[PDB]
Each structure stands twice: as C-alpha cells, then as structure tokens.
Amino acid sequence: GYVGDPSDEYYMVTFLSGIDYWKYCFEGFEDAAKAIGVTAKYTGQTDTDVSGQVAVLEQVIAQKPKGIAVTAVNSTALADTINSAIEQGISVVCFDSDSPTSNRSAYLGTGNYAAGQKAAEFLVPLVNYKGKIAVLYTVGAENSESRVQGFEDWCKQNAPEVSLVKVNDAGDTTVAADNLAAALQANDDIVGVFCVDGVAGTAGPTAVAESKKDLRVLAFDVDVTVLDKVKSGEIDGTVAQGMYNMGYWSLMMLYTEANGLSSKALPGNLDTGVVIVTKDNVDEYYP
Ligand SMILES: OC[C@H]1O[C@@H](O)[C@H](O)[C@@H](O)[C@@H]1O
C-alpha cells in the first residue's frame, strides 16, 4: 500500500527554478511524500534554456528515481527525454506546464486555455470592450501559449473591437520589460496588459509604470510585489494558481503508478483551479 520506503525518491523538476512560485509547488510535493514515507527531491533549470532543462532532466533520470513530476519549459522539446524516462521504468507526470505529445501519464495544473478565457472576461470589460491588449508571455511554454490562445479566442468571439499585441517575455524580466516597452512605443492604441505568467507579472507593471501610461493590468501569480500592486490599485488584479495541490497530487499519482496500486492507468488531468485576486481577497494570499 501507501507505506513508503525513504530510499525511494520522487523528483520535482522545473525551469526558472529559483523563483518563489516553485516553493509552494514543492511544499505540496514534500507534504505528500512525508505522509507516505518516501523522499521528495527538487531541482530545475535556473532560466528558460531548453537544452539546459533537457540536461537537468537527464541528470535526474540518471539517479533512477521512482517518479518525476516535470513542468516543461517548451511544449515539445522535452518529450523524447520524458519518453526515455518512462522506457527506463520511471513514472512521469507533468505539472504546471504540459508536454502533451509525450507519454507522460497525467497533467496536473491550471486549465490554461480556460484561464486565458477567464483573464479576458476580467480585463476586456475594464477597457470597455475596445482597444488593443498587450499579452506578455513566455513564448514556447505550453501553459503560456494556451493562456494566450484562450484569451485570443474569447476576444474573437465576444469582443470584436479588441485586438491583441503579442509580446515575448523570454523568461527574463529585463528582456520582458524592454519588449513590452517597445510594444507600448509602437502601439498607441494599447489600453491593457495581460501578464500571462510570473515573469510577466513582474516585468509588465514595471514597463507600464516607466511608460507613465494609465492602463488596465491583470498580473499572474502571487508574488508579494504583485499583491502589493493589487492592494494599492496600481494594477487591477492577478491570477492565483493551485500551486500546492499541483505538487501534492503529482506525488500521490506518481507513487500510485510506481507501486502498481491502481489497476488502471492514471487519470489524465487534474484541474487545480484559478482564483481572480482583487482588493477584496488579496490579503488571503500573503505568506
Ligand atoms: O513565469 C514564471 C512561472 O509563471 C507561472 O504562471 C507559470 O505557471 C509557470 O510555468 C512559470 O514558470
């Protein structure tokens, strides 16, 4: 059953691996590991370098863990490595950002397309259903690309006078602020900014402030600096993800599969939910 052996290891593998976002994800992973009695391990690529993250995942596969929960920095570039891990007998699920062409057993995380629709439902009314919205996001990551597509589809169906400007945040807060600054310079009709991920939630408001433009801004994630800007009204809100539950249930699924406790293959998708954070509930999200 669920009496674990501490020599059995389960790895969480990330990108942008030092940011606080992963501390909440790993807290859930480790809490489940401790409840079962196995050992949770953490590592990742420190930036968004794709070949870098492939190498990190290879270093993990070489330690022969029982299971790996990985968030893929690119939608397809980790698929062969994931498939290799599974061929070597390691259980693999994806959390937070999927590798949907790989053989991973399950995805656990935000419903990213739906969250982009929810973001558009929030932001479009605030700009009175007209004008251009800058969408600042990590090109190549499945979760960011799906959030963008949900936002874009919602506007196409429900706000015909709204148009989008896509802006790469490049996984780098300095480059992201420069790229949004350039977008604002060239597009006088921008009225709002959707920061699609945590990098953009930091860089976006910074670029907006430096432009001195009065824009509607929806951040992503719950960095204290972002929450403080919701509380002051500098930005209009942010989007909180179920970080802890991504980690907790990734560990439970990995251990279940690795020990053959379920007669069927794992269920394919756990929706860990989003909450729109405004002044009304921002206090709940401080550490
Ligand atoms: O940009 C930093 C982080 O922001 C989050 O919104 C995404 O879910 C993560 O995949 C990403 O690593």
Residue numbers in the entry: 33 to 319
What text comes from the article?
Clostridium thermocellum has extensive potential in lignocellulose biorefineries as an environmentally prominent, thermophilic, cellulolytic bacterium. Previously, five putative sugar transporters, denoted A to D and L and belonging to the ABC transport systems group, were identified in the genome of C. thermocellum, and the solute-binding lipoproteins (SBP) of these ABC transporters were shown to bind different dextrins by isothermal titration calorimetry (ITC) assays. To gain insight into the structural mechanism of the transporter specificities, 11 crystal structures, both alone and in complex with appropriate saccharides, were solved for all 5 putative sugar-binding proteins, thus providing detailed specific interactions between the proteins and the corresponding saccharides. Combined genetic, biophysical, and structural studies have provided solid evidence that transporter A and transporter B are the major glucose and cellodextrin transporters, respectively, among the five potential sugar transporters in C. thermocellum.
The crystal structures of both unliganded and glucose-liganded CbpA were determined to 2.10 and 1.85 Å resolution, respectively. Unambiguous electron density for β-d-glucose was observed in the CbpA/Glc complex, indicating that the ligand molecule was bound in a single chair conformation. Hence, the structure of unliganded CbpA assumes an open conformation, while CbpA in complex with glucose adopts a closed-conformation, resulting in approximately 37° rigid-body rotation with respect to the unliganded CbpA structure. The glucose is bound via hydrogen-bonding interactions and CH-Pi interactions with CbpA. Furthermore, the binding pocket of CbpA is distinctly small for the accommodation of a monosaccharide, and no additional space appears available for the binding of larger cellodextrins in CbpA, thus explaining the functional specificity of transporter A. However, in C. thermocellum CbpA, a phenylalanine residue (F47) occupies the corresponding location and thus cannot form a similar hydrogen bonding interaction with the substrate. In addition, W54 in CbpA adopted a conformation that is also inconsistent with hydrogen bond formation. The reduced interactions between sugar and protein in CbpA are consistent with the fact that the affinity between glucose and CbpA (KD of 240 μM) is much lower than that of the other binding proteins (KD of 1 μM or less). The ITC experiments showed that among all of the tested substrates, only CbpA binds to glucose, with a dissociation constant (KD) of 240 μM. Unlike other monosaccharide-binding proteins with strong affinities to the substrate (KD in the μM range), the binding of CbpA to glucose is remarkably weak as shown by ITC experiments.
